[PDB]
Amino acid sequence: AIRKKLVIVGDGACGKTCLLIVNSKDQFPEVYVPTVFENYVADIEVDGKQVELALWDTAGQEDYDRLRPLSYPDTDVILMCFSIDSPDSLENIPEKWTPEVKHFCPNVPIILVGNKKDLRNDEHTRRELAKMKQEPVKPEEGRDMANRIGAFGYMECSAKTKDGVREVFEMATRAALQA
Ligand SMILES: Nc1nc2c(ncn2[C@@H]2O[C@H](COP(=O)(O)OP(=O)(O)O)[C@@H](O)[C@H]2O)c(=O)[nH]1
Numbered sequence: 362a363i364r365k366k367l368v369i370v371g372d373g374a375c376g377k378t379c380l381l382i383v384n385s386k387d388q389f390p391e392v393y394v395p396t397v398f399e400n401y402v403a404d405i406e407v408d409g410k411q412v413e414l415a416l417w418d419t420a421g422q423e424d425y426d427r428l429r430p431l432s433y434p435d436t437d438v439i440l441m442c443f444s445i446d447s448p449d450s451l452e453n454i455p456e457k458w459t460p461e462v463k464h465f466c467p468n469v470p471i472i473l474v475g476n477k478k479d480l481r482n483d484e485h486t487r488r489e490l491a492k493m494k495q496e497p498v499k500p501e502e503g504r505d506m507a508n509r510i511g512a513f514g515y516m517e518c519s520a521k522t523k524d525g526v527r528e529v530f531e532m533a534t535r536a537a538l539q540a
């Protein structure tokens with residue numbers, strides 16, 4: 362099989378680890394979620410090509426901020442994430458994540474991923490955002506951001522319901538294979 366490396370980045374609590382867990386174990390972690398990952402090589406077949414895709418999870422706060430640059434060498438594809446229930450997390454895409462990834466991973470394809478799509482029509486989420494005069498991120502807003510940052514594409518998923526998860530990783534593998 363062809364060996365490729367994926368790195369996932371984005372604001373704390375935007376659903377990175379749960380996304381990796383759901384693709385790998387086919388089960389949303391209902392109780393315990395480790396800070397990261399670590400060490401899962403996905404077997405993915407796309408367009409008649411068997412790929413081993415190493416999943417490198419990352420985190421924030423002092424220690425994991427310090428360590429995060431060590432994830433970047435020899436990356437073939439980046440999943441850059443925000444949460445659909447967090448306009449703040451989308452704002453950090455151009456402010457923080459894009460400059461960081463462009464510095465360490467020039468020319469590496471980026472898939473921009475909107476996580477927690479299940480929260481888009483969630484009553485509690487709507488109500489909490491409405492008191493801020495905010496609303497969940499719209500798909501067109503995600504797409505606009507992907508265009509702006511020069512991403513390979515924009516995708517949405519819910520780790521919680523599993524919807525769109527398989528497709529995120531299939532598209533990431535296609536990006537890792539090219540060029
Ligand atoms: N509603 C919803 N919650 C999610 C989803 N994915 C993760 N979460 C929750 O979001 C929180 C952070 O998830 P985690 O994967 O640890 O985020 P990370 O810090 O980006 O790795 C946890 O409480 C998860 O249960 C999702 O798709 N939908």
Ligand SMILES: [Mg+2]
Binds near residue numbers: 377378396397398
């Ligand atoms: Mg995590």
